[PDB]
Design a protein around this ligand. Structure first.
Ligand SMILES: [Mg+2]
Ligand SMILES: [Mg+2]
Ligand SMILES: [Mg+2]
Ligand SMILES: [Mg+2]
Ligand SMILES: [Mg+2]
Ligand SMILES: [Mg+2]
Ligand SMILES: [Mg+2]
Ligand SMILES: [Mg+2]
Ligand SMILES: [Mg+2]
Ligand SMILES: [Mg+2]
Ligand SMILES: [Mg+2]
Ligand SMILES: [Mg+2]
Ligand SMILES: [Mg+2]
Ligand SMILES: [Mg+2]
Ligand SMILES: [Mg+2]
Ligand SMILES: [Mg+2]
Ligand SMILES: [Mg+2]
Ligand SMILES: [Mg+2]
Ligand SMILES: [Mg+2]
Ligand SMILES: [Mg+2]
Ligand SMILES: [Mg+2]
Ligand SMILES: [Mg+2]
Ligand SMILES: [Mg+2]
Ligand SMILES: [Mg+2]
Ligand SMILES: [Mg+2]
Ligand SMILES: [Mg+2]
Ligand SMILES: [Mg+2]
Ligand SMILES: [Mg+2]
Ligand SMILES: [Mg+2]
Ligand SMILES: [Mg+2]
Ligand SMILES: [Mg+2]
Ligand SMILES: [Mg+2]
Ligand SMILES: [Mg+2]
Ligand SMILES: [Mg+2]
Ligand SMILES: [Mg+2]
Ligand SMILES: [Mg+2]
Ligand SMILES: [Mg+2]
Ligand SMILES: [Mg+2]
Ligand SMILES: [Mg+2]
Ligand SMILES: [Mg+2]
Ligand SMILES: [Mg+2]
Ligand SMILES: [Zn+2]
Lengths: 155, 150, 87, 81, 129, 144
RNA sequence: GGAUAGUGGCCUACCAUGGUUUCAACGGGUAACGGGGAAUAAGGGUUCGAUUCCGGAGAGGGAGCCUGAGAAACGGCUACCA
RNA sequence: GCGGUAAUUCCAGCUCCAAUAGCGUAUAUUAAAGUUGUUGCAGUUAAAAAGCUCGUAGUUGAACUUUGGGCCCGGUUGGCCGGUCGGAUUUCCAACGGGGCCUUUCCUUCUGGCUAACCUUGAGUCCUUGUGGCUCUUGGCGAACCAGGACUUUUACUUUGAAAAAAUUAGAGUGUUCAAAGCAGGCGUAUUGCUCGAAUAUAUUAGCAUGGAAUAAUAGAAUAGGACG
RNA sequence: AGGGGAUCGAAGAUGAUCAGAUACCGUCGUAGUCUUAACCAUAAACUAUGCCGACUAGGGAUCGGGUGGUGUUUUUUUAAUGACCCACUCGGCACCUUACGAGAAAUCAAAGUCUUUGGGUUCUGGGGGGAGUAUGGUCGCAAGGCUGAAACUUAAAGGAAUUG
């Protein structure tokens, strides 16, 4: 989520061990680190362009992605810097030899490299436990905005 | 079929196999697309127009002599209403029925039709709402329905 | 209904309605078989010799013995117009 | 009955059917060119008009609406096509 | 409202046969119906059929003999695991030597015998005996 | 197609509906209500031992006329009091009050045997031995 | 940040208002350790699994700890309750 | 249902029947039960359609979008021969499958690495009057997949396969004297050893991997904020 | 809670009948019956028969809409009309005859197209009593409505048809 400020905390925010020698007058102020999570996921430019901090960013932070890669549909974005997706799926009761609709919500961290609104299909990746619930991290938006601007005023 | 009744009435138009021509129909898209617009411009609903073209003139199927459905002529020329006209007319009726209900609290039958009429509105509203033609969160309320029509 | 090697096994291969080609079973005692005569030169009817039709008791009961005969006799050569394939 | 052509129904029994229950379905209305010989030129009219079709140049009349088929006015003539 | 267009077409075929008729009119046809219609015929269960062409959803006239007792539809197109197919045939075909369960696979609509030989499976559509 | 949802996803409904309807099954209900453990004089067990409080003379139901010899027993693990039949000619002469006896069911699944009203149990042993054995002559009833 | 072998509201501080639910959350019951399996034989099912193998939990009930590579151990200790 | 005086049911004697080192009885559960019904019930009068309509969840939901035709290679059953000293393959023949083409036809994609394959061909030719046949470098196939970049509308189904504990189950082999079992055993020079074994299957829901692209969803270009360059 | 309160008339009081007669029949007649503003939510609220869709069979009436017709009648001068007549077509309330078919039958054009058992979907029943009882919840001014068990008892209860 973030938005604005960057130094909005009691502790000074910084990328660990990414020194900038004040003696060397430079143009970029802060040297910034980044990587690619791998598995073929492009690291969005907003991660390399940005100045947000986030130690739980999969491109600019100290996490790794390894394990289940899942996709789900965004259903809540009220948490700051983390979301809840719903993964729906059908479930085969035998005996009746058909299925019933089930689901589970899955809480997932979300780097301010992405701007997510509710309804977006998103691909997330497996994480070291990041928080009490969260064990996943948004890792690409396979969506956009769900055609909102083609809902406008009048002729 | 028959949504809010137990009618079983199969009445309808029977459109011809002939998806073009009428061959004995001279004139031209030119002439008739313009024809649509001037009426749209008067203030008529595409339906009223499709009719006032079916009788006075030779416009059998407005989509045929002009490869377009009348409501698309209208939008394309920016003549298209706030809300679709079926929805427009449902709402317009609900208002007048309501107006009767307010002056006639004793008329339970009218209360019953209002529900019906409003229920259709609400389903329809949802359709258009689902398919972009209305904004998400477009809503119908009595309190503000009267303004919508007139 | 043969078997392992040629050999026609199990008896009675049954008749068939000439109008519906369903089986004509035993207790079907409503069914029928109509022998129409083979005629020759100047009136006269070659006896022993027939063009033969079989009709299911069903068909008869359903009132279609007569029409379904018109159509059969005609398109086998023994009716001249009478019937129509269009309605 | 029991055996027939459903692919080639006879003219007059298809004719008498309902316009949606014909083999392929189609209308059974028609258009006409009508004239009230005060004016010279002649307008195109629908057999089931709903709209009381005014004439081209004058505000005379022509046909009134009905149950179905329009009822034309006193001294006029027509033709299908 | 019209629920399984196949269902009606199948059922109609059956009612004309049972009342001894030789032709049906069916409405409204579909890819699937034809592809079904086509399987029966391939095995003699019906004559020929004409797609008449309203500018709508279609009609068909089937020409049927009498070799046909029932041609029903399986109303939820269940899934079959190529093992399971014996189970279906066994449950609704009169003997293990004629009659077909036609179904629907990646490799096309096709009776179970063909579907056996090609070695594919999928959903189950209907049957003919 | 009267009734049950036939759809391919209608599984959930189909089970719950079943769930809800087994309750009309008389001994599906018994089973999960624990009517054994809760009601029933015995635990939910095959037999139960008890103590003979008094010897009764239950008169049989119609159209039979007879006196059916029975003992009121107080189940040990319970104090639940229960009247029990004492099968075969005599045998009531084998019991006496305060004796311990082995009750057992009548094989009608709860439910009175026949013209004995109320009695849902029968005696199998007394003072540890078995009526049956006593009845024949094979064995003798213990001292005190 | 502290604590841990180490992630992690695991704990603390500051901050925010979130998290779950008729696709049954939350609560109640279970005469409930879970599985491999067992019984009943057209099939579909129904019922059962304390119990020879695998996993977990316990050592009268709780809690705490010493030693140690490994125990919150009970044929170790300490305290309370019985 | 028997017994209230000739009791085919009680108490016995005789005789008889059923299962038999075993056979009653009690409780539970399973089959019989299509009396819980997905397969598969019933509901006018036997138990059961809510007085009525609206309606959310839920389930359900008309038709239509590469079809039809042409050529190529190579498989496995089966026939009619057997060339052979029980089984063998060539051409002849069906029939049923798999693969790649060309028909206006993404195969995601550019950049080499590679080539396995012919429009090649460079000579000619074992040899049946030759397109029956393959070794064979010098202009001319992509994709068979490497690895590096740049990017990919979502799903359900279904195939095949991996990853898998044993005992249990199904089942092969072996004559524990039989059998339940067990996993042994079997040959001899039985005086200094020879040897076959200790299979196979099922293991599904989920996750993984690969083929298919019917059926059923999803997304797309309409205030063009479209698509290619 | 107002108003209205002709009539008929729960209650009650009477005349009679009766062994009795708290009744039936007769008289008086409170509430009620009607209406407004609020409640209540139940009837054998019935077709004891869910709704949507497809298909399967003959007949004559009728109700509404429609198309056709050198139909009849209205006369005026012939039309226009209106009503009537005949054929067709949709959609109604129904009746008739059938039996392809269904069913335990009575019967049923659905209650048919089901062991040749699958178009979609909702709801209810699972032997009889106990009992719509107890308990909790809830709605109601009340009366009561909705939801709704067990123990225990029991071999039947029940349905259609036949002969008596
Ligand atoms: Mg927050
Ligand atoms: Mg509706
Ligand atoms: Mg309709
Ligand atoms: Mg209409
Ligand atoms: Mg009940
Ligand atoms: Mg007593
Ligand atoms: Mg105790
Ligand atoms: Mg924290
Ligand atoms: Mg809060
Ligand atoms: Mg539930
Ligand atoms: Mg326990
Ligand atoms: Mg266990
Ligand atoms: Mg269990
Ligand atoms: Mg225990
Ligand atoms: Mg321990
Ligand atoms: Mg102890
Ligand atoms: Mg405590
Ligand atoms: Mg301890
Ligand atoms: Mg000890
Ligand atoms: Mg120990
Ligand atoms: Mg005697
Ligand atoms: Mg005797
Ligand atoms: Mg005896
Ligand atoms: Mg036995
Ligand atoms: Mg099934
Ligand atoms: Mg039943
Ligand atoms: Mg009833
Ligand atoms: Mg009803
Ligand atoms: Mg309700
Ligand atoms: Mg479809
Ligand atoms: Mg598999
Ligand atoms: Mg094994
Ligand atoms: Mg009064
Ligand atoms: Mg009185
Ligand atoms: Mg008196
Ligand atoms: Mg009284
Ligand atoms: Mg009621
Ligand atoms: Mg009635
Ligand atoms: Mg009729
Ligand atoms: Mg009671
Ligand atoms: Mg009796
Ligand atoms: Zn004019």
């Amino acid at each position: 989520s973030t938005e604005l400020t960057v130094q909005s905390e009691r502790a000074f925010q910084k990328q660990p061990h990414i020194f900038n020698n004040p003696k060397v007058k430079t143009s970029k102020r802060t040297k910034r680190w980044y990587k690619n999570a791998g598995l073929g996921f492009k690291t969005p430019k907003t991660a390399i362009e940005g100045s947000y901090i986030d130690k739980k960013c999969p491109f600019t932070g100290l996490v790794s992605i390894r394990g289940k890669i899942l996709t789900g549909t965004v259903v809540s974005t009220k948490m700051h810097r983390t979301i809840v997706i719903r993964r729906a799926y059908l479930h085969y009761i035998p005996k009746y030899n058909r299925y019933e609709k089930r689901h589970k919500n899955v809480p997932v961290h979300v780097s301010p490299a992405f701007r997510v609104q509710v309804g977006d299909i998103v691909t997330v990746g497996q994480c070291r436990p990041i928080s009490k619930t969260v064990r996943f991290n948004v890792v690409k938006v396979s969506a956009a905005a769900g055609k909102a601007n083609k809902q406008f005023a009048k002729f | 079929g028959r949504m809010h009744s137990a009618g079983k009435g199969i009445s309808s138009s029977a459109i011809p196999y002939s998806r073009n021509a009428p061959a004995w129909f001279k004139l031209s898209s030119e002439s008739v697309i313009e024809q649509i617009v001037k009426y749209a411009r008067k203030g008529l609903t595409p339906s009223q127009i499709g009719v006032l073209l079916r009788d006075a003139h030779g416009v059998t199927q407005a989509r045929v002599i002009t490869g377009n459905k009348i409501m698309r002529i209208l939008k394309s020329n920016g003549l298209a209403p706030e809300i679709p006209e079926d929805l427009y007319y449902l709402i317009k009726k609900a208002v007048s029925v309501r107006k009767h209900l307010e002056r006639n609290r004793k008329d339970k039958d009218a209360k019953f039709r209002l529900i019906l009429i409003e229920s259709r509105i609400h389903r329809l509203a949802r359709y258009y709402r689902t398919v972009a033609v209305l904004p998400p969160n477009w809503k119908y309320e009595s309190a503000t329905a009267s303004a919508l029509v007139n | 209904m043969e078997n392992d090697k040629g050999q026609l096994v199990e008896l009675y291969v049954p008749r068939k309605c000439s109008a519906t080609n369903r089986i004509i079973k035993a207790d079907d005692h409503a069914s029928v078989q109509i022998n129409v005569a083979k005629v020759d030169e100047e009136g006269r009817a070659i006896p022993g010799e027939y063009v033969t039709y079989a009709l299911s008791g069903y068909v008869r009961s359903r009132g279609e013995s007569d029409d379904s005969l018109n159509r059969l006799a005609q398109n086998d050569g023994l009716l001249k117009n009478v019937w129509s394939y269009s309605r | 009955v029991l055996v027939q052509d459903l692919l080639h129904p006879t003219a007059a029994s298809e004719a008498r059917k309902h316009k949606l229950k014909t083999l392929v379905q189609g209308p059974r209305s028609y258009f006409l060119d009508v004239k009230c010989p005060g004016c010279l030129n002649i307008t195109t009219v629908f057999s089931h008009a709903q709209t009381a079709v005014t004439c081209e140049s004058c505000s005379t009349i022509l046909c009134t609406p009905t149950g179905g088929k329009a009822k034309l006015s006193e001294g006029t003539s027509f033709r299908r096509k | 409202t019209r629920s399984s267009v196949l269902a009606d077409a199948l059922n109609a075929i059956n009612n004309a046969e049972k009342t001894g008729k030789r032709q049906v009119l069916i409405r409204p046809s579909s890819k699937v119906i034809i592809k079904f219609l086509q399987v029966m015929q391939k095995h003699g269960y019906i004559g020929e059929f004409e797609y008449i062409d309203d500018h709508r959803s279609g009609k068909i006239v089937v020409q049927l003999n009498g070799r046909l007792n029932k041609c029903g539809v399986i109303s939820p197109r269940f899934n079959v695991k190529i093992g399971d197919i014996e189970k279906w045939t066994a449950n609704l075909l009169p003997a293990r030597q004629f009659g077909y369960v036609i179904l629907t696979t990646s490799a096309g609509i096709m009776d179970h015998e063909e579907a056996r030989r090609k070695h594919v499976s999928g959903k189950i559509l209907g049957f003919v005996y | 197609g009267k009734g049950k949802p036939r759809g391919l996803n209608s599984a959930r409904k189909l089970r719950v509906h079943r769930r809800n309807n087994r309750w009309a099954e008389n001994n599906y209900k018994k089973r999960l209500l624990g009517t054994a453990f809760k009601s029933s004089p015995f635990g939910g067990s095959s037999h139960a031992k008890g103590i003979v409080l008094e010897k009764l003379g239950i008169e049989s139901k119609q159209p039979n006329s007879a006196i059916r010899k029975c003992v009121r027993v107080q189940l040990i693990k319970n104090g639940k009091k229960v009247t029990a039949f004492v099968p075969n000619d005599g045998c009531l002469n084998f019991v006496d009050e305060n004796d311990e006896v082995l009750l057992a069911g009548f094989g009608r699944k709860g439910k009175a045997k026949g013209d004995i009203p109320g009695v849902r149990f029968k005696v199998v042993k007394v003072s540890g031995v078995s009526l049956l054995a006593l009845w024949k002559e094979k064995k003798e009833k213990p001292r005190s």
